[PDB]
Design a protein around this ligand. Structure first.
Ligand SMILES: COc1nccc2cc[nH]c12
Length: 209
């Protein structure tokens, strides 16, 4: 049972700009997603300071990067607070309408796409490198859900019957054919070292057979 939703017009416009603007510095997508994971981990850590049972769904707070060259996917897994179904539908827990407004004014005034995270809509930089993004998420207060979009104005949400997660979010980037450098170990290592050196959670880059 799959529900299909239209993006708000402003978010569709943000996505189209990310997909269609010529902009070579695409590697910042990974910095933005790791930053989102770190923010999510901070939230469950803060809740656990007064309620340790918030971590009954998993005590480890970490970020895993999982490339898969056979599936042509890069997956960013974190064990942060996760998202409810309502959060997924409401632009993955962002204030993306007002963030898009500010971002596009900043671009017109001289900013570049790499500054997207300053406007709270860094998730959508995934579409720099991905033709399709799948987000699997589990929040303590809701069931496990899968969000998916290939842009084009719509996204789907469904209950996820697959691999249970415990708690957190998994962002699965189905990479564009010409963006497979981001499955290479040395390239991912370089980006993490350049842009994510002060992320306060272990980031484990998985290797492939
Ligand atoms: C569809 O179900 C599943 N697919 C893959 C992995 C796992 C682990 C538990 N369930 C799984």
């Amino acid at each position: 049972e799959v529900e299909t939703f239209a993006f708000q017009a402003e978010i569709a416009q943000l996505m189209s700009l990310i997909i269609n603007t010529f902009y070579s510095n695409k590697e910042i997508f990974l910095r933005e997603l790791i930053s989102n994971s770190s923010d999510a981990l901070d939230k469950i850590r803060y809740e656990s300071l007064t309620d340790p049972s918030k971590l009954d769904s998993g005590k480890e707070l970490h970020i895993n990067l999982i490339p898969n060259k056979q599936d042509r996917t890069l997956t960013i897994v974190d064990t942060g607070i996760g998202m409810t179904k309502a959060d997924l539908i409401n632009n993955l827990g962002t204030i993306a309408k007002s963030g898009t407004k500010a971002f596009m004014e900043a671009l017109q005034a001289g900013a570049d796409i790499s500054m997207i995270g300053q406007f709270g809509v860094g998730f959508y930089s995934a579409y720099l490198v991905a033709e399709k993004v799948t987000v699997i998420t589990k929040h303590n207060d809701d069931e496990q859900y899968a969000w998916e979009s290939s842009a084009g104005g719509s996204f789907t949400v469904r209950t996820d019957t697959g691999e249970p997660m415990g708690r957190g979010t998994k962002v699965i980037l189905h990479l564009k054919e010409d963006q497979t450098e981001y499955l290479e170990e040395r390239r991912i290592k370089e980006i993490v070292k350049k842009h994510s050196q002060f992320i306060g959670y272990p980031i484990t880059l998985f290797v492939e057979k």
